[PDB]
Amino acid sequence: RLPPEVNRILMIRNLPYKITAEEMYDIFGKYGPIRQIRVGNTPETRGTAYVVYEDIFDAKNACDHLSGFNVCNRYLVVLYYNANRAFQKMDTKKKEEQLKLLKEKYGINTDPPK
Amino acid sequence: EQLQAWRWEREIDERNRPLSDEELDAMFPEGYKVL
């Protein structure tokens, strides 16, 4: 059924800036119940978002259908979550703490998007 | 692959466990607001 990279959490890039909570839930919720959505709100993060699905199959389905899907006047980039990629802008050293914190406390994978 | 099939089955399942807000917070870098 599903490869090692597939995850419940999706990473979204190239979001329209003026997108409402409603619209997010509308777009992504179509594929199954949503655990939550975080939305980039600082200069370095505007336009990106993380949507968390309650079920990994829903996530897998949404990622298939939405990657490169046009909304407003832009093609969405959607990728599976990855702890390493998500913590890139962390200074090379302080990365390790969180990366290892996660792998230890919550057992979720730390490996780079290979 | 009776052992491969179980194992995959078991992998997909750990990746499908309920998640605490607390679990989730440690998942994300700064600069994001929860909708």
Side-chain angles (χ1 to χ4, degrees):
Chain A
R1 27 1 80 221
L2 54 83
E5 73 278 358
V6 330
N7 201 289
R8 227 124 99 260
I9 311 156
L10 257 49
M11 208 275 168
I12 328 299
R13 281 218 282 256
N14 195 39
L15 252 66
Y17 281 160
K18 312 164 215 298
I19 196 156
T20 71
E22 164 77 305
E23 280 160 358
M24 281 304 279
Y25 276 102
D26 214 48
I27 290 162
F28 292 88
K30 184 212 170 181
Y31 301 97
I34 303 284
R35 229 261 82 166
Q36 70 182 176
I37 294 164
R38 311 210 178 180
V39 162
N41 71 169
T42 65
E44 332 212 4
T45 56
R46 272 138 71 244
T48 59
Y50 297 98
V51 30
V52 186
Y53 281 84
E54 301 272 13
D55 167 88
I56 200 170
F57 290 115
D58 295 343
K60 188 254 157 59
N61 188 15
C63 188
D64 290 347
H65 281 58
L66 292 171
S67 179
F69 165 81
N70 177 292
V71 50
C72 296
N73 268 189
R74 26 176 49 90
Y75 294 70
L76 289 175
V77 170
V78 331
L79 321 172
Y80 285 112
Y81 174 88
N82 175 325
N84 203 294
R85 202 228 331 102
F87 284 110
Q88 276 169 342
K89 274 176 192 161
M90 208 158 186
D91 62 307
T92 55
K93 181 268 315 302
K94 268 173 40 52
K95 208 186 181 179
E96 318 302 73
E97 291 90 297
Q98 194 81 2
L99 283 157
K100 226 148 195 183
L101 154 77
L102 284 164
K103 197 153 216 176
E104 270 160 285
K105 267 198 73 62
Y106 306 121
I108 51 97
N109 200 252
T110 199
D111 294 80
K114 188 38 62 71
Chain B
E1 71 203 74
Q2 192 195 7
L3 220 202
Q4 272 275 103
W6 185 86
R7 210 98 127 162
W8 290 337
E9 227 101 67
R10 199 89 306 277
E11 225 317 309
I12 70 180
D13 224 70
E14 301 186 327
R15 286 194 280 169
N16 218 38
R17 300 260 64 84
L19 296 151
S20 63
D21 281 2
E22 175 219 17
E23 232 265 54
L24 256 30
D25 278 294
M27 298 279 222
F28 303 118
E30 349 164 285
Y32 294 84
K33 138 218 199 68
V34 184
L35 275 189

